[PDB]
Design a protein around this ligand. Structure first.
Ligand SMILES: [Cu+2]
Length: 124
């Protein structure tokens, strides 16, 4: 199954957001990260990927398709806007094994508040 996540100058929770900020997909599904507005990318947050996952970083303005082969929860950021809160989480599969590591990982305040709301929305 194929999903999209958008990089936006403005959205639900204010400036510099991914939408949806919280998504559940199955292992093997794809997410295309679509910069609706100019100036965004996607990159995994160091410490917020599961066992055997590869880190990734797209170029600015790239429509970037990821096939999520390793199950678990992923924290993602936009590289320039991370510190302004531009984050998302992708849960790949059921009962993610790294849920504690992701809840506990250290992030700038604005990113942590948005990560916590995205994690809460997953309802683990
Ligand atoms: Cu951005």
């Amino acid at each position: 199954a194929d999903f999209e996540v958008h990089m936006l100058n403005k959205g639900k929770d204010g400036a510099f957001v991914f939408e949806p900020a919280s998504l559940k997909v199955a292992p093997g599904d794809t997410v295309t990260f679509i910069p609706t507005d100019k100036g965004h990318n996607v990159e995994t947050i160091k410490g917020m990927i599961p066992d055997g996952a590869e880190a990734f970083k797209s170029k600015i303005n790239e429509n970037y398709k990821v096939t999520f082969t390793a199950p678990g929860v992923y924290g993602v950021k936009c590289t320039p806007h991370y510190g302004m809160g531009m984050v998302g989480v992708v849960q790949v599969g059921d009962a993610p094994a790294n849920l504690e590591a992701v809840k506990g990982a250290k992030n700038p305040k604005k990113a942590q508040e948005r990560l916590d709301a995205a994690l809460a929305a997953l309802g683990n």
